[PDB]
């Protein structure tokens, strides 16, 4: 209540305080407890193999230099006091670019407790690397992580833990990606060894299952409709050479434009994806429909009955063998 008394108490905490020295310097490691409250996952990029996360990142530790008596309150202090305190050197090892939000002030909290416990909160947006396996794309499941580490302090000086264990991370239900569902999240803790020593690590991982619906509408259905269009040729008189070759050309070339367009939406991977396998199958069907007409055109003068029979056969065999192709494909990948 007496603000001069609180000012005196806080001035005494910071008098002769050395920001250069971690709590218990030269003694047992300082234990830092971590909480995260997920605000959003804004974007997931196959092209850049990364995702953008916004979170409230909370660190808890004890600094006995900040212990205070005669005030039965937790002190919430203006954010700018963080610049006068030691704080952990925590970083995100797989981040590409991160920032702390800055409006209307730096999005930072400091809450002190009488025993010298510090609660330090930051609101962070991070773009973090997620290497993706696109062999089953777009029927794929990805594992995207956030790797949390001490930059310069080894496990002699600092230890990390998930504060609350498996409840340390909240807000996974807030994640609203149109193209993905979050199947599961996991929290891991370990030590990592480098040439400069052993460092504490925490890992948060997500399993992201791609939703098929966009791909049905954008690629699969158009490819199916072009393949069906190619079969119209088999009901057209074999003397209609311009009409049947036009159907053949337009379907073959449309199937090439769909293929080349698709791979411009993805990174330059050297392997075949599931959707590439579908488009390559559809290509073979529409190419064979044109070769069927070439065969009919070539023989119908000399052998008009054989030519007629091949068109009749094609009307059943193309739809049947495309149905078989689809059955095998969608069983293998779903």
């Amino acid at each position, epitope marked *: 209540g007496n603000m001069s008394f609180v000012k005196e108490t806080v001035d005494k905490l910071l008098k002769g305080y050395d920001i250069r020295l971690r709590p218990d310097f030269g003694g047992p490691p300082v234990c830092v407890g971590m909480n995260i409250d997920i605000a959003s996952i804004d974007m997931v990029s196959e092209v850049n193999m990364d995702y953008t996360l916004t979170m409230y990142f909370q660190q808890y530790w004890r600094d006995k230099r900040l212990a205070y008596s005669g005030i039965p309150l937790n002190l919430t202090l203006d954010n700018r006091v963080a610049d006068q305190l030691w704080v952990p050197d925590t970083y995100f090892l797989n981040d590409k670019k991160s920032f702390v939000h800055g409006v209307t002030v730096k999005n930072r909290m400091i809450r002190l407790h009488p025993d010298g416990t510090v609660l330090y909160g930051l609101r962070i947006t991070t773009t973090a690397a997620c290497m993706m396996d696109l062999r089953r794309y777009p029927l794929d499941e990805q594992n995207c992580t956030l790797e949390i580490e001490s930059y310069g302090y080894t496990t002699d000086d600092i230890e990390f833990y998930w504060r609350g264990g498996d409840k340390a991370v909240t807000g996974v239900e807030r994640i609203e990606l149109p193209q993905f569902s979050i199947v599961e999240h996991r929290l891991v803790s370990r*030590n*990592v*060894v480098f040439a400069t020593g052993a460092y504490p690590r925490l890992s948060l991982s997500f399993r992201l299952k791609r939703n098929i619906g966009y791909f049905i509408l954008q690629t699969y259905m158009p490819s199916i409709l072009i393949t069906i269009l190619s079969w119209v040729s088999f009901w057209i008189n074999y003397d209609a050479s311009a009409a049947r070759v036009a159907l053949g050309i337009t379907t073959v070339l449309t199937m090439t434009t769909i293929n080349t367009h698709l791979r411009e939406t993805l990174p330059k991977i050297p392997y075949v994806t599931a959707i590439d396998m579908y488009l390559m199958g559809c290509f073979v069907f529409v190419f064979l429909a044109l070769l069927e007409y070439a065969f009919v055109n070539y023989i119908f003068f000399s052998q008009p009955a054989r030519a007629a029979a091949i068109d009749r056969w094609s009307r059943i065999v193309f739809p049947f063998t495309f149905s078989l192709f689809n059955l095998v494909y969608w069983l293998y990948y779903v």
Partner: nanobody
Amino acid sequence: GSLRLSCAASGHTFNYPIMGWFRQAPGKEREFVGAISWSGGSTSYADSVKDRFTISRDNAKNTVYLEMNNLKPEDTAVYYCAAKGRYSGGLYYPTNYDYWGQGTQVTV
């Protein structure tokens, strides 16, 4: 004499892009021999086996092999295979590796 140790992997190998060869002599600590990336075949060796042993793999079989040529009586240990996660630290340190093979004993 020339020898070819082999190491066959199965499961989520995408999350574990590196395979390492270690060897443990009786009494001594577990020791780095070499490591290979599944994708690219980027290779590294301990000095002791540099220009003697050669590691490589085939992604078809999901198999890595240590080709132990020009052997010596120092090369007498339980040889283990192990997998390292993408962000799991330096190649050389066996505590960074998660999935350890049984371990073949080799004496010469």
